Design a binder for this molecule. Structure first.
Ligand code: HEM
Ligand SMILES: O=C(C1CCN(c2cncnc2-c2ccc(F)cc2)CC1)N1CC(F)C1
Length: 436
C-alpha cells in the first residue's frame, strides 16, 4: 500500500499538457511523477491562495536540485531562486530588492531603449519580405545584451554576433538542466559550459572590484547588490551562485516571453493592427519610449498578460507540505511536494472560458481579475523579483517592433512548445519582415 496510491491519478507537447489532461480528468489534487519525484498537482484557486500567500509554506528544495548543481557542477547553488531555507532566502532578497526599486528600474529605460532600437535597426535592414529571420534567436540576443548591460555594466554585443562561446555555453547548460530532470560528450559539454558561466562571473566580479579600487565610474546595479549581500562571506561561491542566477534568469524567460508573443501575434492580424495603432497614437515618431509612455500602452499590457496565460515560460512552482493535510477533499501525506501550475490552470475551461482562444480583452479594465488562476511570475513572498524589470523591458522591445515592422511567420513554422529549464517555442519563430 504505497503512501500516495489513494490520491486520484492515472493507472510540440510538453509534460505540462499531460498534467493538464490529468487535472481535467482526475480533479484538483492529482499524483504525478516530475523531476524523478512523486508530487501532487494542486489546481484549485483556494489551494493556490492558501499555499502561495503564506510564509508558512516554503519551496521544496528537492525540486530545485537541477538548478543547484548539474552533473556534479555547481550552477545556481544557493542563489535567490534555488535557496529554499526561509531565513537564508530572506536576507539576500531584501538586499537585492534595492536594485529593483522604482527609481532603480526607471534608470534602466535608456538601456532598454538602446538595445530595442539596435534590434529594430538590424531587423529593418532584413525587411525584404523574403529573408527568413529567427525571431527566437534575435529576441534572445536582445534580452542577453539588455541584461548584461543593465545588471552587470557589461556589453555582450550578441546583436553584433559577438560572444558565440557564451551563447553556446548557455544553450548547453539549459540542455543539462533538462537532461538532469528529464553520454560522455554530453556530460563533458554540459559540465564545461557550467564552469564557463561561473568563470564569466569570476572575470566580471574581478573587473568590478578593480574598477572600484582604481576609483573608476560604477553605476548602482544588480551586481552592486549581489556583492553587498556577500559582504564578509568566507569565499565567493555565494556571489557566483547569484551572478549565474541573475545572468541566466534575467534574460531567458524574457526572451521566451518575447518569442511566444511574436509567434502568437503572427496569426492575430486584427490584434496586431490594434497594437500598431496604439503605439502610433501613444509614441508616434518618438525613437525613445519614456517611463510615462509604458503605462499608456494599455492594450499592449493586456496582450502580454494573455501571452503569459497561454505561454508562461515558468510554468509554476513547488511548496513543501510538511504535515499531512486535507487538500480539496484529498488526504495528502506529510513531506510531499505540491506542484502549482499557471500553465495548467490557464488552459482549464473551469477557470477560463474558451481557454485556447487568445483574447486580450480578458485583461481589460472592468473585466473581473483572475482570482488565483493566473500566476506567470508566481505569487506571495517567492514571486519573481524581476517581474517589473521584465514587464518594462518586454514592453519597450515590443513597442519598438510594432512601431517599425510587419512580421509574417514563415509557412511551416509551428506554434508548439519545448521545455528546457523553461517553456519556449519549439521552432525558431522564423519570420519575414517588411517596414511599416
Ligand atoms: C517574463 C519574464 C519572467 C518570468 C515569466 C519570470 C517568472 C518567474 C517565476 C514563476 C518565479 C518563481 C519561481 C519559483 O517559484 O521557483 C520567478 C522567480 C525569480 N525570477 Fe523571474 N521571471 C521573469 C523575469 C525575471 C527577470 C528579468 C529576472 C531578473 C532580472 C528574474 C529573476 C528571478 C529570480 C532571481 C527569482 C527568485 C525570486 C525569489 O525567490 O526571491 N526573473 N520568476
Ligand atoms: O526551475 C524552475 C524555474 C525555472 C525558471 N526560473 C526563472 C525565473 N525567472 C527568470 N528566469 C528563470 C530561469 C530561466 C532559466 C533558467 F535556466 C533558470 C531559471 C524560476 C524557477 N523551477 C520552479 C520549480 F518548479 C522548479
Amino acid at each position: 500500500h504505497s503512501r500516495y496510491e489513494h490520491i486520484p491519478g492515472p493507472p510540440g507537447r510538453v509534460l505540462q499538457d499531460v498534467f493538464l489532461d490529468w487535472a481535467k480528468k482526475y480533479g484538483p489534487v492529482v499524483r504525478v511523477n516530475v523531476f524523478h519525484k512523486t508530487s501532487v498537482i494542486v489546481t484549485s484557486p483556494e489551494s493556490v491562495k492558501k499555499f502561495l500567500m503564506s510564509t508558512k509554506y516554503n519551496k521544496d528544495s528537492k525540486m530545485y536540485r537541477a538548478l543547484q548543481t548539474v552533473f556534479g557542477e555547481r550552477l545556481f547553488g544557493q542563489g535567490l531562486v534555488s535557496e529554499c531555507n526561509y531565513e537564508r532566502w530572506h536576507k539576500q532578497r531584501r538586499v537585492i530588492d534595492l536594485a529593483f526599486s522604482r527609481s532603480s528600474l526607471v534608470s534602466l529605460m535608456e538601456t532598454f531603449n538602446e538595445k530595442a532600437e539596435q534590434l529594430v535597426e538590424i531587423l529593418e535592414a532584413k525587411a525584404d519580405g523574403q529573408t527568413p529571420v529567427s525571431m527566437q534567436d534575435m529576441l534572445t540576443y536582445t534580452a542577453m545584451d539588455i541584461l548584461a548591460k543593465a545588471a552587470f555594466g557589461m556589453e555582450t554585443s550578441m546583436l553584433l554576433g559577438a560572444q558565440k562561446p557564451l551563447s553556446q555555453a548557455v544553450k548547453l547548460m539549459l540542455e543539462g538542466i533538462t537532461a538532469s530532470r528529464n553520454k560522455r560528450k554530453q556530460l563533458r559539454e554540459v559540465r564545461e559550459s557550467i564552469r564557463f558561466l561561473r568563470q564569466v562571473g569570476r572575470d566580471w566580479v574581478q573587473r568590478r572590484r578593480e574598477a572600484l579600487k582604481r576609483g573608476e565610474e560604477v553605476p548602482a546595479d544588480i551586481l552592486t547588490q549581489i556583492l553587498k549581500a556577500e559582504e564578509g562571506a568566507q569565499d565567493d561561491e555565494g556571489l557566483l551562485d547569484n551572478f549565474v542566477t541573475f545572468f541566466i534568469a534575467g534574460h531567458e524567460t524574457s526572451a521566451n516571453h518575447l518569442a511566444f508573443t511574436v509567434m502568437e501575434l503572427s496569426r492575430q492580424p486584427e490584434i496586431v493592427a490594434r497594437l500598431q495603432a496604439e503605439v502610433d497614437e501613444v509614441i508616434g515618431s518618438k525613437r525613445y519610449l519614456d517611463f510615462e509612455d509604458l503605462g499608456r500602452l494599455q492594450y499592449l499590457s493586456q496582450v502580454l498578460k494573455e501571452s503569459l496565460r497561454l505561454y508562461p515560460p515558468a510554468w509554476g512552482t513547488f511548496r513543501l507540505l510538511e504535515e499531512e493535510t486535507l487538500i480539496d477533499g484529498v488526504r495528502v501525506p506529510g513531506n510531499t511536494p505540491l506542484l502549482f501550475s499557471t500553465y495548467v490552470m490557464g488552459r482549464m475551461d473551469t477557470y477560463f472560458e474558451d481557454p485556447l482562444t487568445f483574447n486580450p480583452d480578458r485583461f481589460g479594465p472592468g473585466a473581473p481579475k483572475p482570482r488565483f488562476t493566473y500566476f506567470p511570475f508566481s505569487l506571495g513572498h517567492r514571486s519573481c523579483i524581476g517581474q517589473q524589470f521584465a514587464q518594462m523591458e518586454v514592453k519597450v522591445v515590443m513597442a519598438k517592433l510594432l512601431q517599425r515592422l510587419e512580421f509574417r511567420l514563415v509557412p511551416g513554422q509551428r506554434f508548439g512548445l519545448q521545455e528546457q529549464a523553461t517553456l519556449k517555442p519549439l521552432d525558431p519563430v522564423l519570420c519575414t519582415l517588411r517596414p511599416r
